[PDB]
Design a protein around this ligand. Sequence first.
Ligand SMILES: Nc1nc2c(ncn2[C@@H]2O[C@H](COP(=O)(O)OP(=O)(O)OP(=O)(O)O)[C@@H](O)[C@H]2O)c(=O)[nH]1
Ligand SMILES: CN[C@@H]1CCc2c(ccc(O)c2O)[C@H]1O
Lengths: 51, 280, 332, 231
Amino acid sequence: ARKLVEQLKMEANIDRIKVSKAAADLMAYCEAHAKEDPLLTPVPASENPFR
Amino acid sequence: MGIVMSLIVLAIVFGNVLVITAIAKFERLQTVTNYFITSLACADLVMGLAVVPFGAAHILTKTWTFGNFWCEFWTSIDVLCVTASIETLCVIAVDRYFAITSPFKYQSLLTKNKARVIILMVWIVSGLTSFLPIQMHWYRATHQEAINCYAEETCCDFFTNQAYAIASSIVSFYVPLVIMVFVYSRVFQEAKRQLQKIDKSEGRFHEHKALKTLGIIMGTFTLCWLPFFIVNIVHVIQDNLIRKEVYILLNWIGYVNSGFNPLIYCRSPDFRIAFQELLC
Amino acid sequence: DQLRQEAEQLKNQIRDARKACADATLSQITNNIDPVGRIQMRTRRTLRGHLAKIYAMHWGTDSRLLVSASQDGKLIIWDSYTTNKVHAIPLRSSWVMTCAYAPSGNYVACGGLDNICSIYNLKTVRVSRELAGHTGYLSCCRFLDDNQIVTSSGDTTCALWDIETGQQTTTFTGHTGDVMSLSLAPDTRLFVSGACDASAKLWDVREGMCRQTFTGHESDINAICFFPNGNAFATGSDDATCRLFDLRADQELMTYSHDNIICGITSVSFSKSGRLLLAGYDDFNCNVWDALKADRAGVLAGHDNRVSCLGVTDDGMAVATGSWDSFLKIWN
Amino acid sequence: RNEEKAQREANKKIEKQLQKDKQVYRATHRLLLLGAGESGKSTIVKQMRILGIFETKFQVDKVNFHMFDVGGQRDERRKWIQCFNDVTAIIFVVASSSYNMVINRLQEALNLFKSIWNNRWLRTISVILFLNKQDLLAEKVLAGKSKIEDYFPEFARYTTPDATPEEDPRVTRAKYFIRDEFLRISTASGDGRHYCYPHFTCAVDTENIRRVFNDCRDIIQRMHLRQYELL
Ligand SMILES: Nc1nc2c(ncn2[C@@H]2O[C@H](COP(=O)(O)OP(=O)(O)OP(=O)(O)O)[C@@H](O)[C@H]2O)c(=O)[nH]1
Ligand SMILES: CN[C@@H]1CCc2c(ccc(O)c2O)[C@H]1O
């Protein structure tokens, strides 16, 4: 009954930031942590444990 | 005829090699039934790679350019391959009979260990009738032409007595024929019964396939290997009745059957996908 | 009644606010980034011993051991380095659909059509506790801690359990369809869930109240993965699409789909850096996407049946897949 | 050093146990019992057996059968049915005397059967059909206030089809019309992989287990015949 209306009212009033800032933050994190991805950058076979 | 013989050799080798490599490479084709298929393919490949070229060279040059030992080895390999290429078909027929007639107990009865024993026994029986009585001189004939051929080291035909000719034929061809006939008759009866049941149950809303399949399977083998195994006894029972050219022609017609086994026993859609995956 | 008409307004307000906040799309911002390029991986290990198809697996916290479940009623704990088994736990019921590996490496849990979540003690292998209370089949379970676990079942509810006493602590309600998957945040302070009503929700583990709702999809959701940054997640549904939602922006960002695929999606996972998104499909193979470009970078073929499980090690050294062909493969 | 040997010994023991259990797993046959409410599903189980899950195991002629009854989950949506794509057969139980009662039960059963038949994951699974309550139907037909034509208009232009009574023509006509109602849905949808099977059962019946045995044998035989391109 009124539970759905109350929940919609509760979730309506929240702080929302611009999508551009979120995209920039995601890109910055991906670029910063891009040097420690063995799948993305194939590590030498000397340190490869599965091979 | 050299071009025709080379084409025959290429056709024999290519199909068997492709079947063997397709079975070995993939993991979804490793079934208990496929072990018999790969055994048959190995036998056919050994035949087409060992006995056909030397026979072609002998029939072309009309003079054996090797020693007596190599001729005896060639004859033994021929007999071994011919004997081992038919008992595998008999085993396949028996396996299908067991699979269809008794569906509940099939899974227990053939287990992979049980199969590697059957194949080894078949190969041992095949080798026990080819190498043993040929490396020893038990099969040697008695007429003067036979001794003249045996003494000579530049030519060697096939001369045999009555006992070996009857026994080898019985072991190789005649025994594995009645079993296959009975098996396929029972399978046809079961298929007809199932078709009648389906038609009686749900015929108001909705036997060529079984006839076609069994006809192809039985007819190719019978037409390929039947006349030779009759003239084999005929030329021994009655003297001066079968010419050497006719004997060689019938024997070479028998050889061609080894190149048709992939075309008959490897029509499954899984084999089609496997053949399309590689070399395509 | 009057209220139902009244309710729609709030939806219009939320849609207008989300449309207003959308300054620019992710594709426009991420256009000068150099592409990753073609990525090729080859099978390194193969694990055999399961008599039936595999639903679930979970990597260990040490990226060395892993657990797996099958429909023959047996859990096996493999050693990926030496490709030899360690344990083989029989099950009372042969229908299991999930499994989990505790962060402390001491317990392994599983469940299925029977509405019971069993917990096993590896370092004592006997049943330790049995949690009951769900009225539907379980779908997932993740060890929040060595003493408490959270589960999601087919009765449109998710619950938090207490292993010591075997009693429910918090119950999460609000979904309409059957909940199929969940994933925890790195700090274990929030978790998401995807039901069959094409809607994913954000839950608060402490308060026990739904915070946000996302309804971008149009079919049932089958898998959910959480971005390493802790402010995004990706979902996969039956319409051969993947979507990258956001929390702070409170809207989706990008969709991953192609016109040559008409199958479903069974599992979704990320990478250590988050650059690559891995998703399993019903085409008997897996795909690798680019998170910031939505451009395919490779395909992982080699499975003879549909892929139902997918996971990446904590240190990101290798990825493991499971299929209905009763085979587990390791891709480096 | 010795740790590798210990792990090898443990792996050997586990592999031996798995090899031992493989034969037992392969020997048994699995069945699924699916039906609607008020059909009489609980009765069939007991009679045959005496001879949110419930597993019943019965053995016939040294063959193992293992039947499941998933009654815990009661909902129109069935997301769990993808798990039963490797069973030998599906047993469908429906009350054949339910046509006159609203929440129509027979139409709901027909719709459920149609949904089951056309499922993507159940494209190669046969169905054994049990038409339950074969004497309530006869009692209702013989001097009954309600008529099948009122609820089923197609009954006005139906003929008795090879029919073997045992009976009055009316009950035989009703039984065969109800059976053909299910048979029609089955014939149209699929070519070969699966075939529906009908039966007539009641409370006083002890041959149901033999019927299941024969139907499973026929299913396996037909599968093997079709695999080798003979049917
Ligand atoms: N005369 C007669 N009565 C039956 C027959 N089968 C079932 N019944 C009656 O109908 C009822 C069927 O209910 P149960 O079999 O106990 O359970 P159920 O209603 O089948 O369970 P669901 O159908 O799954 O809801 C029983 O109370 C029986 O007395 C039958 O063959 N003949
Ligand atoms: C020269 N070729 C041989 C001669 C006789 C013979 C063959 C095959 C099987 C037998 O049992 C035989 O007796 C032929 O392949």
